[PDB]
Design a binder for this molecule. Structure first.
Ligand SMILES: [Ir+4]
Ligand SMILES: [Ir+4]
Ligand SMILES: [Ir+4]
Ligand SMILES: [Ir+4]
Ligand SMILES: [Ir+4]
Ligand SMILES: [Ir+4]
Ligand SMILES: [Ir+4]
Ligand SMILES: [Ir+4]
Ligand SMILES: [Ir+4]
Ligand SMILES: [Ir+4]
Ligand SMILES: [Ir+4]
Ligand SMILES: [Ir+4]
Ligand SMILES: [Ir+4]
Ligand SMILES: [Ir+4]
Ligand SMILES: [Ir+4]
Ligand SMILES: [Ir+4]
Ligand SMILES: [Ir+4]
Ligand SMILES: [Ir+4]
Ligand SMILES: [Ir+4]
Ligand SMILES: [Ir+4]
Ligand SMILES: [Ir+4]
Ligand SMILES: [Ir+4]
Ligand SMILES: [Ir+4]
Ligand SMILES: [Ir+4]
Ligand SMILES: [Pd+2]
Ligand SMILES: [Pd+2]
Ligand SMILES: [Pd+2]
Ligand SMILES: [Pd+2]
Lengths: 172, 172, 172, 172
């Protein structure tokens, strides 16, 4: 058992384990999104690469959370990783919408953990969440929103042309 | 009080102070234009960056004017900076039109000061205005007109597509 | 309208817009302070340069605030920028006193926004304010206080000599 | 005789020759000022060097005027160079006052030639005077005024100390 654990509640420890599962689930979702856009009948490599890099970011998020759990003397517990919500992701517009929904859900979970850690008087936790996750989520969600606006502007008329152009001129 | 002031009328001194306020107002306008195009629901970063760089140019214009006022022994006097004319700027076409209107107004003010300094026999002033402001305004207004023509050509049919393309292929 | 806004109250959004106006007003104040010390009858270039660099810092502060407002999905709204409180700034002592008063007012506004964001449960805001504004204001105000103490020590007897010396040996 | 002279009046030609004599006289004045501050009983080497460099500037001004006179097909005519107005120049304050009086007189002569060339419709002349003389005189006279203000501030009490300090900390 730990000899280091201090000011680290069992409620926070569990919530950290839930958040690890959420980040890993999000990484898996992004893996599926990435490979969908690599299908020969979809073939938007800029979209594939955008989602694959998000898969990596989310996995790294989970790993940072796991290192933090061990730094505080908590115990990592892993659960089943639920398969992604869809097997086919539609258009780049549909996929970007799905991505923002996913990210807002991760953000809301961070906010819920921060609130819990406030109620627990755990400032190391508040700080850790702030500096490596909350600012990153805000920045990511702004980029996604920007992309969604550009996609929408493009696929008002001539949807195929607009999807190609966004991929070619925004995504790489 | 000054020991250096020579051939520098109180009328020119006041007009220089009015022009400083106009350049600063124009810088503020461009700040507002820039951030509007950075909204998640507008999201034209090439447009944001074009206007932000104009904000900087106009501030530098005012600073050069203030240094000149002190070089001649005049006294800088600052007034309220009126907020920009709009809170939302519409399309890139609308914004570019607003920009050219603004720049033509600055130009006309430079021309009016040059006329005043003629009537005052103040060639240092004529020279200073010419070399650091009048040629720059002519060049800037030509670039704006060029941009307006390209935007107009693009948004005749398929306005969203054309706005995206101008941003991507002209503005960066 | 925004597709990204999350946990970002209308009260915080408005307070951020007020703070942008305060930073810009402070930048304008510093512009006026800087050019006053560049008058031929004042002629303290170290003082001019100290205030001009603060003008730049305050403008950058406002720009960071505006980028943050857009990152959260809030809407920038600009108001009239009130001219500075004085047209002539007296001695370097008077000016430094004015500067510290100004900075303490900006600081108090940051503290008031941080309190609001506490009451709103907005940790992204707390973090953003902390890391890019609160530590900077504390450091700046300490430097100003140090300068004020040195000026005061100098202008106890032989005020002209002391003002020259501070400018020459502290300010550059 | 010239085969090139065009739009270059005998009135302008004579005024250019008078201005050459004024620049050379000013160079001579600065030579005398420089060596005075190099006396063992004055011994302000920063002041010596400031005036010696102005002697060089004024000679170069005259040489540019002479090259211009030949470029337009006018004929250089030289007159007696009147010795400087004083043989001893007093304090650094007295000398700086004398310098600004001298420079304002050169400036006024440039302005008078510019007016003449206006009345003569000679824009090459206006341009030449503007770009190589009028802006330089304005900049020089502002630096002199700044220096005068600093000297005055220093020699309010403890005149010897203040003169030493200005020389050491402003002039090199
Ligand atoms: Ir990449
Ligand atoms: Ir890559
Ligand atoms: Ir990449
Ligand atoms: Ir917290
Ligand atoms: Ir941490
Ligand atoms: Ir590109
Ligand atoms: Ir390419
Ligand atoms: Ir650029
Ligand atoms: Ir750039
Ligand atoms: Ir740029
Ligand atoms: Ir003119
Ligand atoms: Ir100039
Ligand atoms: Ir500096
Ligand atoms: Ir500097
Ligand atoms: Ir600096
Ligand atoms: Ir807080
Ligand atoms: Ir931030
Ligand atoms: Ir030198
Ligand atoms: Ir030298
Ligand atoms: Ir030198
Ligand atoms: Ir002229
Ligand atoms: Ir010339
Ligand atoms: Ir120095
Ligand atoms: Ir030295
Ligand atoms: Pd890829
Ligand atoms: Pd930008
Ligand atoms: Pd400066
Ligand atoms: Pd020398």
């Amino acid at each position: 058992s730990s000899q280091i654990r201090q000011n680290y509640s069992t409620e926070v420890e569990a919530a950290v384990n839930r958040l690890v599962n959420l980040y890993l689930r999000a990484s898996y979702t992004y893996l599926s999104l990435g490979f969908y856009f690599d299908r020969d009948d979809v073939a938007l490599e800029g979209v594939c690469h955008f989602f694959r890099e998000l898969a990596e970011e989310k996995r790294e998020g989970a790993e940072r959370l796991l290192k933090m759990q061990n730094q505080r003397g908590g115990r990592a517990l892993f659960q089943d990783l639920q398969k992604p919500s869809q097997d086919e992701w539609g258009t780049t517009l549909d996929a970007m919408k799905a991505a923002i929904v996913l990210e807002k859900s991760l953000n809301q979970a961070l906010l819920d953990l921060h609130a819990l850690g406030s109620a627990q008087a755990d400032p190391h936790l508040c700080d850790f969440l702030e500096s490596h996750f909350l600012d990153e989520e805000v920045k990511l969600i702004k980029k996604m929103g920007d992309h969604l606006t550009n996609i929408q502007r493009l696929v008002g008329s001539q949807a195929g042309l607009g999807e190609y152009l966004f991929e070619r001129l925004t995504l790489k």
